[PDB]
Amino acid sequence: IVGGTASVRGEWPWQVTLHTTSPTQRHLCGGSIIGNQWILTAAHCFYGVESPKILRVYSGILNQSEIKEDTSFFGVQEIIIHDQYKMAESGYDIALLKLETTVGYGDSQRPICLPSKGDRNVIYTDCWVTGWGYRKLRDKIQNTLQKAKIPLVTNEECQKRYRGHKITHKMICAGYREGGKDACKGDSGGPLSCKHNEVWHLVGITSWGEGCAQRERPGVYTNVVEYVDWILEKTQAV
Numbered sequence: 001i002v003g004g005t006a007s008v009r010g011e012w013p014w015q016v017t018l019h020t021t022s023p024t025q026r027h028l029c030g031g032s033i034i035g036n037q038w039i040l041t042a043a044h045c046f047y048g049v050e051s052p053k054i055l056r057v058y059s060g061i062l063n064q065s066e067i068k069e070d071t072s073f074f075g076v077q078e079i080i081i082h083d084q085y086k087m088a089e090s091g092y093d094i095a096l097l098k099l100e101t102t103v104g105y106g107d108s109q110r111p112i113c114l115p116s117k118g119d120r121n122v123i124y125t126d127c128w129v130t131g132w133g134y135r136k137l138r139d140k141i142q143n144t145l146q147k148a149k150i151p152l153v154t155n156e157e158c159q160k161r162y163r164g165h166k167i168t169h170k171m172i173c174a175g176y177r178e179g180g181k182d183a184c185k186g187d188s189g190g191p192l193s194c195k196h197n198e199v200w201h202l203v204g205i206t207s208w209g210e211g212c213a214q215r216e217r218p219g220v221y222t223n224v225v226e227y228v229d230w231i232l233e234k235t236q237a238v
């Protein structure tokens with residue numbers, strides 16, 4: 001996260017840190033708890049991931065230093081990548097992790113509501129991007145979960161900012177015209193959480209941008225409301 005501040009413990013209890021153990025253990029991506037065995041994240045996080053066996057989901061984490069060999073985690077039973085996914089820049093950047101065990105909900109770990117299809121018209125004015133990602137292009141994973149408040153950008157304005165790309169309505173952009181606050185390397189897969197009528201909604205999934213927090217380069221997020229039926233197809237299968 002660029003231009004953010006330290007989160008307080010329990011502030012984003014749906015935020016997870018997804019680690020890979022191959023070749024050595026390290027933070028891979030962010031993710032959000034959306035159900036008691038379900039993590040919603042970005043499809044591009046699994047580039048070169050040949051098996052769910054190398055993955056570890058840690059919930060209830062503020063600081064990466066809380067993670068040692070004796071720290072509990074959730075194993076991943078299955079990686080579900082959207083069928084139409086090719087690359088982050090072309091959209092469909094969405095994946096589900098089916099956990100091997102159930103998350104016990106509490107004040108440190110609980111789900112974020114998916115947006116309502118009826119709320120496709122609501123204007124969100126209180127949106128935050130969170131993660132342990134870089135503070136600038138050449139940096140390192142941060143110990144403490146960071147947060148940054150960022151305004152949503154219309155599809156038309158985002159398309160003007162990304163000449164040469166096709167910014168679809170399945171993408172949602174967020175950023176200041178002057179830059180300064182954004183997601184960066186290591187934040188992808190994490191949530192873009194917006195508070196509406198005292199309820200937090202998972203509006204976006206951190207996907208991509210040209211550089212980090214650059215002037216007139218909003219961050220591009222998977223527009224979660226456009227995938228609610230896809231999520232229900234995968235999580236509510238008979």
Ligand SMILES: COC(=O)Nc1ccc2c(c1)NC(=O)CCCCC[C@H](NC(=O)/C=C/c1cc(Cl)ccc1-n1cnnn1)c1nc-2c[nH]1
Pocket residue numbers: 026027028029044045046047133137140141182183184185186187188189206207208209210211212213218219220221
């Ligand atoms: C010690 O542990 C570490 O250093 N871990 C460790 C360290 C670094 C990384 C990973 C692990 N994860 C991966 O590479 C998995 C594969 C994932 C690829 C892509 C991923 N992108 C982002 O996270 C966000 C991009 C992004 C998103 C928005 Cl909305 C705006 C601007 C963005 N940026 C443009 N340029 N940079 N950011 C990324 N993540 C890293 C590099 N790149």
